[model samples]
Target chain A: EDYLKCIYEIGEQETNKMVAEKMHVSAPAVSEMIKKMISQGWDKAKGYLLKDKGYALVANLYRKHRLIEVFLIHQLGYNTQEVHQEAEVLEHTVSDTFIDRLDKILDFPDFCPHGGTIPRYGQPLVEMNTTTLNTITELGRFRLSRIHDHFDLIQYLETHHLNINTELTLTQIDTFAKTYTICYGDKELVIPENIAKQLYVTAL
Target chain B: MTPNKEDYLKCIYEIGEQEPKITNKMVAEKMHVSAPAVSEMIKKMISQGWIVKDKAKGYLLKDKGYALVANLYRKHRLIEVFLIHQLGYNTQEVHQEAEVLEHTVSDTFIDRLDKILDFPDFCPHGGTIPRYGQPLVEMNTTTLNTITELGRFRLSRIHDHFDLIQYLETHHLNINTELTLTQIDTFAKTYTICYGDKELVIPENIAKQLYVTAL
Candidate 1:
């Protein structure tokens, strides 16, 4: 199943070697899955192009995977760190009602835990608006206008006293330390540069 | 009978009031069909014993016609509420969705809905929802202010029939949140009270109209 999804995600760019590396299988095993997928009409191969069926399944699987990832983090109250592994097991076991109820509760957030966009019911990730941490660090004082991506990070922010309508002033930025000092409420929380890389912002 | 015939019967049942008589033009307009089409259908309905004509008033539904119309209307409203308010579907999407689903959703679904919805009589579109098995609870009659006070006192359920539930969801006042009403207004039926630090001021008429119980 993982191999199937891996090949689906990689699509036309996929090869036996790449699929093997991702799926932790041999080149022959990867080739076998490709043959199986092709036979099932879930994919078609023409030269390097995966043609139509492959990309179609990839998009559908990716959406399903992303939706499960989002549902766990937002609704079930799982922390960001816990969701990735939890989602891998829980996604297959969830009923359609669970996904639909989560869809209803969250108003359909457009992004995943990793800050990537989640597609609508049948559409692809055609467009989205995103900001950057560099802009926030430079601005010094700003607000989180809205969460267009990374809801798990938003939940993490809530735990740290950062929230919607939270006002922030950057007290320090260290290039070597790779962290930004942000003052929220009375506490100054240091956000790592790596995490900040995912933190997009807008100035008030 | 065809669904169109059923739809015609139901529409006439609704707009025909308690009388079985309905105007051809009104039925045509309500069903979004032609007057001649309604005229033809009315003749067919009479033959089917689903309807009978009165000399002056127009076309009226018989007891069978009333049951048929009410059954379908009830189903339609249930599906409409489930799709729009419960599922958070957009208004434009719900009409078509309910149309397709009204005939297919089972009785068990309706039973479950009766448990969650606070509506004693009306659907989201303000049409009356007919009862099946047992009917919705008739809590003690009270004003909007009284309901709000009871919401504070934890006596009655605070049914958020307003369009403001989306806003309340962000602030955490939901259909499930238990509340106690602390304030009452006799004239306006409005009151200001705490719903977890976010103050909600509901209109008096809306409060009085809401179904509730007093402890």
Candidate 2:
């Protein structure tokens, strides 16, 4: 899986400079690994190799990485800061079956440790079409429907007790700045334009 | 014993409640255990004074065992809601998440979570979050899924999981806030509550499980 991931990140371009830089290894070393991968039927079309087996293995490995993150950070009560390193170690040791079980146990979440998509194995969720948060009207009730990594923002929300499914009302919008003031009852807060653009809501 | 142990005991106790005595077979069935395995564990429990077995009768939870279940029930319920209400989980994720976390979290973290969540009277899962050091607040025995209209209220507690809490928080729900029930459709199982300058629609199941107080 690591070999595939390195290959994916590095690319199979003939010269092999990009993948080498990403891996921080000498070009020859990457070339050797790529040779081994190709010999194992990993694909070799015009320098890009994402064969069926490679994709499957990468998917399984990706799931393993996420399960470990959720278990350690959420269940084991490790600080969010610990997820990256902890996930790295456990990814090698845990069984594929155990990882699958946990993925099911958690209801096959769509996102991973840093809020990236999981490249899931089941049915694709009905993709909801919506407008950018910045394009919405200046006044009315709105609920936050999506979020990204924004680790610092997540921490702030966690500390202040805000997260997904939070009922938010777009109290005011600055038509000029494209920024806005969000009110959480008695407390009034400001959100930047960039972040506001990600927010999706329904008019009431 | 930890809360997990109490969960096992609760299962055992439920079997005894149904049949008057809990047998290894009963434990095996309820807990999905193998017969031979439960037989061995039951023998060990017998020595530990956790249970009493009569010749033909199965087993009875001793006073110590019963208290342990009650105590754990309280702790589990409390932490479950606290995580949702204070830390932002929802009703669904609270129970399963708490099932794992209850055994491992520090008493300090538990106590702090308990305090920050304002020592909710009941968990989101319909059990009471036990009050410590001489019951600080009176508990409600009857669980009500709905309240009268136009009643200004503060969310007294939630009875679900971190998922519900996370859902609420992610959507910007918090404790001690005010909501005025503006609309209720009894048949559709949905209701709208007024918050700040807007109204929010909440499903009946979600609204009902959340315990609240008149503001």
Candidate 3:
């Protein structure tokens, strides 16, 4: 499931070395798991491309993951960071029926705490009007729409007081120094280049 | 009970709740399998010391077996409380929701849940939630003479009576002792029991003072 989720996020045109690198697992472990996936019909084309079944499996997994994050955040009084931490493990354990009820319990939320769309089994992914912060060279003002799922990056962003829907103005950028200077209401803050790459935002 | 072994153990525990004794046929019926299928599983459980058999009592859970089921119920009832009280779920709706959540939620998650629910004693459904590490033997506990059935029981304690203490000590009876009731002589007001090679007979008065567990 983790492998399928990873493959869905990064394109299927990747290698075992990339999977091992992304998952922080040994090459042999990734090889054995991928071998099983291939034998079990999750992938047919090379470069880790997923079949119809693999995508459906990952879609259901994502739906559960997003719904759980919403429940953890709204019902359990969890912040986005804490919700992400708990939902990571729960996404793998919760059942289809469990998520179906939880989706209702949460009133069928559309997005996860991380701002990723809650996927449906056969439905295409949501088309969002957003772009990663690093891609913006002429940004004026933008709403911090989403943070991609990465613990270190999220912790760094939260430590700097950046959060979902936080509106900030890009004042300046030092391309050589790899720093982004942004104004948050009155005060200004500096975002590192790597952390900026992890953030997604929409023009406000 | 936990994992696959947990599912069967949970089944037996629930079935044992309303039924006096458990049988392979009953287990098969509840699990929707053949009796012979339960036959293999039951044999495995017995081999693992998860169950003990009796000619009259049928199947009895051992120390670890009962402990696992108790732990599962602890989680089960706790989740049920959270669903009904916190989420405002109807009593009937909470059972199945709590059922799946009980198996999936972590110990760390379940522990904090108790604190959040203010340490609930009983689920709204009337099933008592066993506390975190409460001994299983602490339940169904009774004095020896109070036992109405003739079966093997553990001699857990003896009341602070000097005569009974001396009599049991002289007879080599001590705590954590497994003894069997052989006969009850109501006419003579005495009970006959055996442990090791000694078949000791004591008056009902003395037997009443002896603490025992049906485990």
In DockQ terms, which candidate is top? 3
lDDT of each: 0.57, 0.59, 0.70
Any residue pairs clashing in model 3, and if so which?
B1-B68, B2-B6
For candidate 3, write residues B77-155 as lDDT tens digits. 6876766565566534553455567766777667667776778876543345777887432233366665667888787
Please write out the lDDT profile of model 1 over residues B1-215, one tens digit for every residue: 13467777766654444233457776675566877877888888899999888867686667777767666766777666766666666644554444555554445445555546555465554445778743322232333343433444322333222343344545565433445566666676566556556666667534433334343
Reference-based TM-score, model 3: 0.57
Top TM-score model: 3
At residue A61, give the lDDT of candidate 2: 65
Tens-digit per-residue lDDT, B107-158, candidate 2: 5445554665556666554355555533322243221245656666676554
Give stretches of model 1 more than 4 Å off.
A1-54, A57-102, A106-204, B1-3, B18-21, B116-120, B133-215
Candidate 1 lDDT over A117-199, as tens digits, reads: 66666564442435655445464686654343344666677688766546788878887787788886788888786577556
lDDT string, candidate 3, A39-112, tens digits: 76663555766667776677776677778777766656666556655778787665576676566666767777
The order of the candidates by TM-score, greatest first, is: 3, 1, 2
TM-score of 1: 0.37
Model 2, span A1-204: residue lDDT tens: 465555643341213666666557777786786666666655345556566756567656656766666656555566655554445655775455446656766666776544445656633222242444677765876665555434465666667555555666777787787678776545666777766654554555
